[PDB]
Amino acid sequence: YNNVTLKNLTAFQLLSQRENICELLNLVESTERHNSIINPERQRMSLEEMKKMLDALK
Amino acid sequence: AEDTAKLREITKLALQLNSSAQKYQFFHELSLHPRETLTHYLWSSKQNELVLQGDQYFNEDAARTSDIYSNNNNDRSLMGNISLLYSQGRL
Amino acid sequence: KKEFPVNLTIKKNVYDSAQDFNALQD
Amino acid sequence: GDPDTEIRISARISNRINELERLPANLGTYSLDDCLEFITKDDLSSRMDTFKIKALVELKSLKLLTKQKSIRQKLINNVASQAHHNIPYLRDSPFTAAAQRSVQIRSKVIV
Amino acid sequence: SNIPDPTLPPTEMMTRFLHPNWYALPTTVWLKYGNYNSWAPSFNENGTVVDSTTRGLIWLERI
Amino acid sequence: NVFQSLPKETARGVDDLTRMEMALLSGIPEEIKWSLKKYLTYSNKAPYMISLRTLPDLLPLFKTF
Amino acid sequence: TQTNPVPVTYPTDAYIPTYLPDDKVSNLADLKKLIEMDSRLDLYLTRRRLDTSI
Amino acid sequence: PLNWVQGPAIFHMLTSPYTQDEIINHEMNFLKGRLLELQEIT
Amino acid sequence: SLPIEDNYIREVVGSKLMECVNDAVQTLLQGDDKLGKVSDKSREISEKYIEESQAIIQELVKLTMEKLESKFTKLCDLETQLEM
Amino acid sequence: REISEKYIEESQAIIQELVKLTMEKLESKFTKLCDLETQLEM
Amino acid sequence: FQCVATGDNKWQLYEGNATFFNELTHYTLDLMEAISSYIAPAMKDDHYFQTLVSILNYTKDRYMVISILRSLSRLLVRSKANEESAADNLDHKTLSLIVSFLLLECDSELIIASLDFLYQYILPGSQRITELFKSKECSLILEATLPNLLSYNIATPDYHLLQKHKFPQELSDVSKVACTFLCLLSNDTDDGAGSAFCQRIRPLVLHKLADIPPLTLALSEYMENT
Amino acid sequence: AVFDLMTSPFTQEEVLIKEIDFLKNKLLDLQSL
Secondary structure, eight states, X not given: OOSOBHHHXXXXXXXXXXXXXXXXXXXXXXXXXXXXXXXXXXXHHHHHHHHHHHHHOO | OHHHHHHHHHHHHHHHHXXXXXXXXXXXXXXXXXXXXXXXXXXXXXXXXXXXXXXXXXXXXHHSSSTTTTTOXXXXXXXXXXXXXXXXXXX | OOOOOOOTXXXXXXXXXXXXXXXXXX | OOTTTTHHHHHHHHHHHHHHTTSOSOOOOOOTTGGGTOOOSSOOOSOSOTTTTHHHHHHHHTTTHHXXXXXXXXXXXXXXXXXXXXXXXXXXXXXXXXXXXXXXXXXXXXX | OOOOOSSOSOOOOOSSOXXXXXXXXXXXXXXXXXXXXXXXXXXXXSSOSSOHHHHHHHHHTTO | XXXXXXXXXXXXXXXXXXXXXXXXXXXXXXXXXXXXXXHHHHHHHOTTTSOTTTOSTTHHHHHTO | OOSSOEXXXXXXXXXXXXXXXXXXXXXXXXXXXXXXXXHHHHHHXXXXXXXXXX | OOOEEEOOOBOOOXXXXXXXXXXXXXXXXXXXXXXXXXXXXX | OOOSSHHHHHHHOOOHHXXXXXHHHHHHTTOTTTHHHHHHHHHHHHHHHHXXXXXXXXXXXXXXXXXXXXXXXXXXXXXXXXXX | OHHHHHHHHHHHHHHHHHHHHHHXXXXXXXXXXXXXXXXXXX | OHHHHHTOSSSOOOGGGSHHHHHHHHHHHHHHHHHTTSOOSOOTXXXXXXXXXXXXXXXXXXXXXXXXXXXXXXXXXXXXXXXXXXXXXXXXXXXXXXXXXXXXXXXXXXXXXXXXXXXHHSSSOSSSHHHHTOSTTTSSSTTTHHHHTTTSSOOOOOSHHHHOOOOOOOOOHHHHHHHHHHHHHTTOXXXXXXXXXXXXXXXXXXXXXXXXXXXXXXXXXXXXTO | OBOOEEEOXXXXXXXXXXXHHXXXXXXXXXXXO
């Protein structure tokens, strides 16, 4: 799995290409790949950490 | 140390940003032009399916049988170079 | 579809081995 | 792969080989169409060896089974080792065309 | 003749096939200089087909 | 009596140099692909054969693509 | 150290996209400012670690 | 002027890999088989 | 082309969704009244990816800071290491 | 959508303040350390 | 490619077509490297010299950086006598980046490509030495890296084995280039920006000449000019 | 290992000299690495 092949590159391009046309008709959820990457509690924890760094550097 | 794993995490997050940027750019170009990108999809995905369906007649139990050579004139990949490989001595 | 012919006149019976032809009895 | 089920194939091939190697060589035939030929006491009709040939074609095709596999290995590994010069949809690919173009790059000289 | 018996141990018939859709392609080679070099050109490409970003996407969606 | 003195240097058709030279001047696309692939082979294996100094009528032929 | 750099399998210091609209993000230039900050600070640390023995 | 000359020996190997390390090991053998045959001409 | 062991192989050893998606695309590439609806869906999908990308940018900006701060401490050690 | 919208507008004023604060810190660090290095050179 | 190297809004590159352009621009930069020797008379408003200095500050490819440094080194051979585009279009970011490559003590080909460009840039010496020894971060790298590149990849006689009891006779590839660059830098007369620099480096170069006897045969003119 | 016949203004001995001048440079470039 360290290297890529012709079939691997073609299958990678095909899996990256089908999921774009799959979202226009909206027949897939694609919410677990959304919320686990956004993570709004992690975002507000990030804002609290930047505010804590402001309070520590002032 | 922790610097190598930290740079690994920053590089992985930059690759996630590159994925999000390319997925934004594809829908942005599809919003700019709707015509010549769907025919582009119907061409390129069909060619990618033809490439991924180009290695199916060379399996273990598929080559030991006789449903490759016999009566498969619609395949056109093999059984046409036997007049060329015999003239070169490859047998 | 090309198929290998199953020659039943040459093969010997396995279950009974008594109703075969006299040239295939020995 | 799967060597456990290939010995079971070879044991069925060798069974038919040992069965065909127990048939008598003095095998003759008699069809139901010879009555139009009027076979006399010494006639030698031309429909006597219609099954002795077919009893040898199978016996000598079960022995040339390993002979045809070498010709098939010399054919498949010569028509499929390239697979990107006669097949059009594999040579019209963006990865394959760029790879075949980029493997022919001559090295750059210095000054 | 000189042909072998068909109850021989080499009978797999597919062991060195190596189909051309499974060939390894030359991709971008990431290089490492040291622990305190963040302005140097990191990776190198000479005759590569794919980009470092689209290979890093494959590295992302596999590991 | 006349089919015994054929020169062997040109009995296989025309040679590959003028064959690939007329291939780019023709309109057959698979023939143009084959000629450009073989010129990519000659440019790696023997660059002095297809150099512009030896062949003067080679520089307008590659600019059209 | 060696003469050639060490070939590694993991990616390092990937690109940043510049085709994103800056009217909504307004942070890619600030990320570039952070990158040039890190490069200047690493430049000074590398010059100090080379001048600490020569 | 026309001179029918033999072309150079082009290494056209049967299999066609794409990695560089699987080409040099056969290219060195091709050079050892080519230069030792063209050495006796001169 | 000789079936010999093909009898013995048979003795021993006895999608639609993407085609429907491609047919839907082929029906959408006939009338001009649907491409505006596809573009209006893709506009809010692009807004969803803007919201996807900006949080990743902010997380990169956060994760740069600690790696910088360790080098700031290494820099502040030099103020005494040079005075010695 | 409002949860991600709330913590994305107020964050940019935090980022653009703290990066400028680190710039104002590093400028006062380097303008002292370069004078110390010139005194060491002397 | 200048739009991609800068980041302008015009001609936004399509990500599905980036593989049709990344392998396209290398074959154009190779032709620029090939024709870089014959465009050696350069003008002030040279589009090639304006474009490639913005190419160099964006790319992250080692081979491309080496190609740009070779194309800019072999273009300024017979450079000028009074003024050229090289004295003005350097906007203090590229010149601070080419000199900063010399800290890469592992890789050597980038050091060769940087020192060759500096050797071709230092050839006028009138408005080049004061330009190179101008800022506070570009004239202090060579205070320590330039003696360090002399005894590089050379088996110097160590002293830790002599202190813990309880000769190379050769040089390297970068050593002759660094000695030639330092000897041509030593030709700065009338106590300008070069002679003021070379007086603070000789007590450190003399420590390296005490250990390497090829450095006695090398650096001939710098010892005569102190 | 394929061969070819072609027309050229150079003779066969000069083509062999150019092959020597190309293949010795290729050998000196490949044996060094």
